[PDB]
Amino acid sequence: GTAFFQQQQLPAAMADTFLEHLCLLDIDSEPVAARSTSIIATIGPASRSVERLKEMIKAGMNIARLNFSHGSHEYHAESIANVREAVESFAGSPLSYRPVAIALDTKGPGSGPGLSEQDVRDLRFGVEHGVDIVFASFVRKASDVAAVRAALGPEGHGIKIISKIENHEGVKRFDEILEVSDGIMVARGDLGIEIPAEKVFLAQKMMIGRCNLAGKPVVCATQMLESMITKPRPTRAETSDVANAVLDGADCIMLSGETAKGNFPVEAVKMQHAIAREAEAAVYHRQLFEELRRAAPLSRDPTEVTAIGAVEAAFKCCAAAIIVLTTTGRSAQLLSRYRPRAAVIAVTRSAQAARQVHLCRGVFPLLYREPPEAIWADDVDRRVQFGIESGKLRGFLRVGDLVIVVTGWRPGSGYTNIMRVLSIS
Amino acid sequence: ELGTAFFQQQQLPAAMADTFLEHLCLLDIDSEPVAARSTSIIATIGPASRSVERLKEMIKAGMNIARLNFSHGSHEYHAESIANVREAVESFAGSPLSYRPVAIALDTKGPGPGLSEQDVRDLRFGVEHGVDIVFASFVRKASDVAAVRAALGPEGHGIKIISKIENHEGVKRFDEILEVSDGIMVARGDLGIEIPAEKVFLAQKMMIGRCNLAGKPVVCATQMLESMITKPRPTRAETSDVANAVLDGADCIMLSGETAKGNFPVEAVKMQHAIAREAEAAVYHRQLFEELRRAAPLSRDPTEVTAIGAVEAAFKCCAAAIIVLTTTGRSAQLLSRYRPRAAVIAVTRSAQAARQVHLCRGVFPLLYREPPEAIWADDVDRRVQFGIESGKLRGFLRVGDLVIVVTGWRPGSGYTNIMRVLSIS
Amino acid sequence: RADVAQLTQELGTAFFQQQQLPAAMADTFLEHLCLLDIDSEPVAARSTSIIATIGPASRSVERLKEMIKAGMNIARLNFSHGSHEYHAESIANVREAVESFAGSPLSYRPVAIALDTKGPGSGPGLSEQDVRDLRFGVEHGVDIVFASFVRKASDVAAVRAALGPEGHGIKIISKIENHEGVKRFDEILEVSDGIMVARGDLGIEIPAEKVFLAQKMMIGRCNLAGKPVVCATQMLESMITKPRPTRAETSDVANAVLDGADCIMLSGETAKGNFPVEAVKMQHAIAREAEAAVYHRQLFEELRRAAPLSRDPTEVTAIGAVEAAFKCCAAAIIVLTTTGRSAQLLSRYRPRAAVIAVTRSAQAARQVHLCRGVFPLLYREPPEAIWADDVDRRVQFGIESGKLRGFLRVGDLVIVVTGWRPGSGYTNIMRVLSIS
Amino acid sequence: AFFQQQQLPAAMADTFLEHLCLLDIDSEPVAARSTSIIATIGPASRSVERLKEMIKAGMNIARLNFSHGSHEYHAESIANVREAVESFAGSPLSYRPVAIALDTKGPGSGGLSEQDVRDLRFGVEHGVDIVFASFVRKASDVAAVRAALGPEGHGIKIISKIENHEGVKRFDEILEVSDGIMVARGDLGIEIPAEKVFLAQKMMIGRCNLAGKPVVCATQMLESMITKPRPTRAETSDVANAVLDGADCIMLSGETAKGNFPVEAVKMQHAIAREAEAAVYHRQLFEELRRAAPLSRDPTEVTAIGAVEAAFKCCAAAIIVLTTTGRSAQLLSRYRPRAAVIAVTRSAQAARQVHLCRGVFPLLYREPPEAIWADDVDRRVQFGIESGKLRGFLRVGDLVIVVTGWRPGSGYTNIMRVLSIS
C-alpha cells in the first residue's frame, strides 16, 4: 500500500543522492520499526528501587551500568539484585520478557600506569556476581585490555570487554585497542578534558566509523541529555546530539547522571527511545549498506557469508525481520554489522548471550527456556516459531510479512550457514 | 589461504578496481582465465556440420545449441540433422566427464503481414520432433509472438520462443515483444539491411541492456567470425566483436555460415570458446552487480529473493560454484540474471530444462536420472552431492572449496527459498 | 595516491596532513569518518558566520569590540524585548565598535545588523508592532530582518511591503517555528532570501524528537536552492552560566556546520549570559574544526548533479571557478561583486577555498556574511578613469588583504572571478593567477 | 526536440544499464565527428582527385607506409596530398588541415634499422607531422627514433606502435616517453594469442586516456571493404567499440591503400564514429576522468578542467581555444567534453597534429594581425566563432567557452570566458 511507503522515511530512503534524501525527510512520516539503538542507563540512588527499575525496563532500558567509581561491593551487589528482581518480574510471560544486561564500569588506573589493585578486586567481584560486560576505564594500549582479561580469570571468559577511550593516547592507539577489545565506548566526559573540547566530535565520528567497519559495538556516552538531570525536557542541542550519535552509527547510547541521580530517570530513557526511533528511520541505508558491503573484506567463514546473503535478501523483499538462532550471539552480531532495516530477532537459550547482544544495533534478544526436543530439526523449528510468535505479539510481524531465517547445519556455536525466505502465517 | 597466484588469474586485479577506468588499466594479457566458459555457443547445422563425426568434434569444441535454419532444406533434411545431433550427443552418455546436453533450436523462415503457412507447418514439425527452442524470424509486434505461441499447439507450450529483432518496427516495439517472449536474438544480418548499418551497434547494446534488466536471455547473431568461412583465423574486428558481445551482456553468441557451410566449422567454435572465456574474466562485476541490484525492483517472490542472496554470498567467499536444484530451469535463470562469477551448476531431472538452460549465461546443466528416494530431504541431499561430485570430476571444484547451494522447502517447482554455504569435503 | 602524488611532492606531506585532507581524499563516507584525525589542525579561515544576540551582557562598545575580535559577524537585535530607544543605542554601539577598526582598510571587518521581529502572536498575519519595528529598521539602516513565525508566502510579502520602497535592499530571512511553516516550506523559501531554523519555538510546536529532521530537511533544501540558512537556539545554552559547554552542545554546533548551515547563532548565551565573548570563541573554534571535516568529494558531486543546467553566465562561471579551485587546492577565489550575488553563487558549491568578495557596497559587504565562506572586503578608493584598471586595482586589493590576513602566501594559486562590463549581472570570467 | 537528438535521453540516465536501455536508433547525431580518421595512402588513393574526395569524406591524417614503395614514390604521395589539401585553401573559414604521418618499416630481425634512419631523415626533409614508429619494445627505442629525427625534427610527434608481448609489458615506460600510442592489432594478433588482443587494446586505450595522450586503434577495422561495398556486422561493431573504448583515432590500412572502395571506407568510419560518439556515457566518463586526473598547479591544466566543467553546465556548443603548440587544446580534449574544441592556431604544423586529439577541430588562422595584442586575441576568437557558424557548430543564441592566456607565447593559458553567440 501507499501508506506503508509514506511511513519510516521511505520516500527519503529511496532517494538517489544524500542531498535529495535530506530534502525528502518528513516530520509527518512516523517511525514503524522497533527502536534498534540500545539504551544504557547508569544505576544509582534515583534508579535503584525495584519499582523504578521496572518502569525503566518498560521505557526501554537494555543495559544497566554499575559505576564502580562510587559505592562499595555491598552497594553494587544490592544494585545487581534489584535489577535482576525487576527483570525477572516479567519472566512469567516468555513471549514478552526483556533481558537486561549488567555492565561493570571500572574505577580506572588513576595515577598508575596499568591495572590498579581495586580494579582487580572489582573485576573479580563482577565474575563472582555474573556481570555480562566490563566498561574498562582509561584504556591506553592493547596491554591494558589483556590485563583486564587476565583479571577476569578462566571463569570470566564469556564477559565482553568494551574499552573506554578517554584520552589522547587511547585515540592514537585506537587500532591496537579495538583489535583486542570486544567494542568501544566514546567516554566524552574525560575525553573533553584530555583533548580540546572542540575536537571531541572528530574523535567520536572516527571511532564510530572504525567500529562500524570492524563490526564491533560502539557506545556513545556522557552529557547526551544532561539538562534532564533537573529539567523535565532536554535542550535543542541535547536532542540533536542523541539523533546525531545514532546517525553517526553508534550501537548504544548512554545516560549517566540522568538515570543515576537525576529527577527524571524514566523520562530520560523515554526521550532517548523516542529520538533513536526517529533517527533510525532517517538513516540513508542505500549508501550505508553499499559502503559496509564494499568495505567488508572477502571471507571464507560460513557465518560471515550467510550474514551478508541474508541482509541482501532482507533488503530485496523489505523483510520485517531476520530471525537468527545463536548460542554466543555471534551470528546476530555479523547480521547487525551490515545495518539491515529488518529487525534481527535473536533466539537463544544462553541468558548471558541474550543480555550481551543488546551491545549490537538492531538485535532483539529472545531467551528460550524450553528443554530440548529429542529431534534436533524439531528443536530448531520450535525456536524459529517462538521467534515468530514473540515477533507477532510485540508488533514486529504480521501475517503476510516476509522473514529471513538464519540457522546452522549442526548444534553448537560456529556452524551457521543457512538462510531461508519465510512467509508469516 | 588462496595464494597470490589465485588473485593474479581471471583478471582479479582488474575486478577489484574502484572505477571502470582503473579496471581497464589493470586488464592483463598474462592473467589466464580459470573459470569454465559461461556464454553459450549456438552453431548452425548445415552441409559442413551435419555428419555425426563432425558433430562430435563440435560438441568437444564447445557447441551448446544446434540451430536448424528452416529458411533452407526440407523437413526430411532437418529430421536427419536432428537425429545426427542426438546420435553425436548420446555417444558420450557412457562418460560423465564428456556428456553434455545439447539444445535443438528451430529458426523459422519468416513472414506477408503475420505468421506464414510454411511457418505453421515448420513449428508443428518442431513440436513433433521435440525441439527445445524456436528462433522466430522477423518479429515486429507482440501479436507475432502470440501467433507463434498459439502455433506451438497443445503439446509445445514448454518450448522457448526467442524473438528475432530484424527491422525498424521490431526495434520500436521492443518492450512489448520482450514482455511476451522468453528472450531475444539481435539478428544483425537483416537488421543491418532494414536500418542504416552504422546504427546496428546501438540496437544491439540497447536490446542486450533491456534483456539483462528483464532477466531474459539475449543472443548476439550474424557475421561474428564471417571471414572464418574461408580462412582458418578471424580478423581483428571479428575477435573484438565476439569479445564486445560478451562484455555488452549477451547470454549466447552464434555462428551461421561459419559452421553451416564454411571450411572451418570446428575452428570457428573453438575461436568463440577462447574469446568468450577471456571476455568473461574481464567483466567488471563490481559495477555490473550493483547496477543489476539497484535496477531490479523489490520482490516478494522467494526464488528471486533467494537468488540475489545466493549471488551476494558467492561473491563474498569467491565460491567455486552455486549448485541449484531446478525442474523448469527458472531458479537457475534467476541466479544467472545477477551475473555471478561462480558457475551455476543446475541439477535437474528434466532433459528439456537441462537443454534449455544453455540460453542463460553461466548455467551448466546436469541431468539427474536416479530413482527418487522415499524421504524427500534424502533425495535433495543426493542431488546436491551429485552436483558436487560432477563438479569435482569436471574441474569446477576441489576439497576445501566453498559452494552455495540453492534449494526449496518442499518438492515441486516454484518453492526455492533456501541458500546454504557448504565446504567441499 | 597517483591523483595527489605530484602535488604531495610539491606542497609536502605536512600540507596533506592538516585540515583533514587525508579524510577529504577518501573514496567512501565510511573511510572519510575512519580517517578523521584530532591531530589534523584546521588551517583555513572560519567560513560559517556567527550571529550574536545583543543585550545587557553584550551592549558596551568595549564588550562589542571583544566580540568582533572573537568572531561575531552579525549582531542580532531581538525586538521581542526592549524599546526603540534601547535598540537604537545598541545599533549605535555596534557601529562605534565596528568603525574603531576602519583605520586599517586591508584588515577592517564589516558587521551586519539584523532585526528579529516580535511576531504575529495570536494574530493571523503581520502585527501592528511589527509594522512599527520594521519601519524603525529601515530608518536605522538594518541589513537583515529575521521574520518571526513565517507560516506562508503571504507573510513574507507582508514583511516586504512593511519595509517600503526604501527597504528594498534589506534581506528577509524567514523563521520557521511551527508545523505550518515546515509544511509550506517550499513556498516560503521561494519568496525569502533565506531561512532560520528557529528550534526554540519549533521544539514546542512539534515533538522535540522531530526537530532534528526539520533542521536537516530545511538545511538540505536551502543548500539545494543556494540560499542562506541559519541554525538557531540553545546551541551552547549551558554557557549562559558556565565557562565551558556540555559534550552535547559542542556536538550540536559541529553537526549544524556538517548539516550545511551557513550561519550559527547565540541567543541568551550572548544577550544575557555570563560568558558572551567565550561563547563566540567556542562557536568559532568548533566551526573551524567542523568545516575541515566536511566531505567535499561527495558534497560537491551532489551539488553539481542536483543543480540544473544553466545559461546564466554568473552561474556557469561560478561552477567553473569552484572546479578550478579544487583542481589546484587554491588558497582563495577573489570575486568582484556589487550586490553580493556572484559571491553567493560561488558559495552554493561549498568550495574549500575562501571566497574573498571585493565590493564598494557597504551594505553588500555586511550582508554577504549570510553566505558560508564569503569574506567581504570593502573597497573605498575613488574610481580609475579606465574601467579595466579599476577592476585590476580591486583584484590587487583582494590579493594584498589576502596576504596581510594570512589567506594567501607567495606561490599559492588563486582564482579571480570578474565581468566583461561594469554593473551587476555580467560576471563571466575566471582567471588562474600565481601569487608573487 | 533538442533533448531527443544525440542520445540525450540516454546521456541523462543514472546508471550505465539505464543508459544502454535508452539508446535510440531514431535519435540522430548532431555534433561534428570527433574521432579522427587515418587513411593509408597507396595505389587506390594516390591521385589528387581521389585524395580530394577522401578529404571531403572525412580523412584527417594521411599515412605513408614505408614498409612498401621507394622514397620517390612517397614524395609523390606527399605532393599529391598537399595539392589536394591546398585546393580548398581559397575558403579559409572552411579549409581542413590534413596531417602527414610516416609509418616506419621497423627493426625486423634486429633496435633502429639503417633503413629506418634514412626514412626518418626523409620525413624530416619532407616536413612530416607524425611518425608511427613500428615495433616499439622499450623506452630506448623511442629515444633512438627521436635522435634519428635530429634537431630539424624536434616538433614531430612520435606515436609508438605496440605490436608484441614486450611492448605490452613495457607499456608504461614507452607511453611515458612517447607522444601517443598505436594499438597495431595486425602484428599484435600474431605475437600474442588472437583472443587476447581486445584486452591489450582496452588496457592501452584506458592508460592513454588516463595519461591524456593520443591513442590510435588500427588494422582490419573494415577489412571486407577492400573488395565489398559494405562492411560486415563485426566490422561496424569494431569501429563503434574502438570509439566507445576511448580511442582518439581510427585507422584504415588496405581498405584505402589498395581496396576497391577507399572513399566508401572513409565515409563508413565517419558515419559509425558520429553514432558512437553520441552514445558515449559522459556522466560516468567525465566523473572518472576528473577523479583520476591528478591535482595540478599548472594554470593550463586548471583552466582546462574549469572550462570543460563550465561547458557541461550550459550545454556549450563549443570551447574555442587559442593555442600555439596544440597543448591547451590537448588538455581540454583529455576530459572528453561533449562540446567541440575549436582550436585557433597560427601554426600549420600544430593545426595538422591536433587531429591526434579527439574532439579538437583545428582552424588555421591566416587573417591579418592586429597591432594591439588584446584585439588580435579577440579577432582569433571571432575567427573561431565565424568558422563555427559557417561549418554548423554554432548558431546565434548558443553559449561558448573561450580559453585564452594573459600574455603571448605558449604555456600561459589561464582564462576562461562564457560568451553568448551574436
Ligand SMILES: Nc1cccc(S(=O)(=O)N2CCN(S(=O)(=O)c3ccc(O)c(O)c3)CC2)c1
Ligand atoms: N555512517 C555512514 C556511513 C556511510 C554513509 C553514510 S550517509 O549515507 O548517511 N552519508 C552522510 C554524509 N554524506 S556527505 O557526503 O557528508 C554529505 C553531507 C551533506 C550533503 O548535503 C551532501 O550532499 C553530502 C555522505 C552520505 C553514513
Ligand SMILES: Nc1cccc(S(=O)(=O)N2CCN(S(=O)(=O)c3ccc(O)c(O)c3)CC2)c1
Ligand atoms: N550495468 C552495466 C552493464 C554492462 C556493463 C557495465 S560496466 O560496469 O562494464 N561499465 C561499462 C562502461 N561504462 S562507461 O561509463 O561507459 C565508461 C566507458 C569508458 C571509460 O573509460 C569509463 O571510465 C567509463 C561504465 C560501466 C555495467
Ligand SMILES: O=P(O)(O)OC[C@H]1O[C@](O)(COP(=O)(O)O)[C@@H](O)[C@@H]1O
Ligand atoms: O552464533 P553462534 O554462537 O555461532 O550460534 C549459532 C549456532 O546455533 C545453531 O543455529 C543452533 O544450535 P543449537 O541447537 O546448539 O542451539 C547452530 O546450528 C549454529 O551453529
Ligand SMILES: O=P(O)(O)OC[C@H]1O[C@](O)(COP(=O)(O)O)[C@@H](O)[C@@H]1O
Ligand atoms: O527452478 P524451479 O523449477 O522453480 O524448481 C525449484 C524446485 O526444486 C526444488 O529445490 C526441489 O524440488 P523436487 O524435489 O521436486 O525436484 C524445490 O523445492 C523447488 O521448488
Ligand SMILES: O=P(O)(O)OC[C@H]1O[C@](O)(COP(=O)(O)O)[C@@H](O)[C@@H]1O
Ligand atoms: O555580483 P554582481 O552584483 O552581479 O556584480 C558583479 C559585477 O562586478 C564586476 O566585476 C565589476 O563591476 P563594477 O565595475 O560595477 O563594480 C562586473 O563586471 C560584474 O557584473
Ligand SMILES: O=P(O)(O)OC[C@H]1O[C@](O)(COP(=O)(O)O)[C@@H](O)[C@@H]1O
Ligand atoms: O596551447 P599553447 O601552446 O600553450 O598556446 C596558448 C597561448 O595562446 C595564447 O592565448 C595567445 O598567444 P599568441 O598571441 O602567442 O598567439 C597565449 O596567451 C597562450 O599562452
Ligand SMILES: O=C([O-])C(=O)[O-]
Ligand atoms: O567515564 C565516562 O563515561 C566519561 O569519562 O565520559
Ligand SMILES: O=C([O-])C(=O)[O-]
Ligand atoms: O536470420 C538472421 O540471423 C539475420 O537475419 O541476421
Ligand SMILES: O=C([O-])C(=O)[O-]
Ligand atoms: O525565536 C527563535 O529564535 C526560536 O524560537 O528559536
Ligand SMILES: O=C([O-])C(=O)[O-]
Ligand atoms: O603495423 C600495423 O599497423 C600492424 O601490424 O597492425
Ligand SMILES: [K+]
Ligand atoms: K568509572
Ligand SMILES: [K+]
Ligand atoms: K531462418
Ligand SMILES: [K+]
Ligand atoms: K523575536
Ligand SMILES: [K+]
Ligand atoms: K610500416
Ligand SMILES: [Mg+2]
Ligand atoms: Mg571517564
Ligand SMILES: [Mg+2]
Ligand atoms: Mg533474418
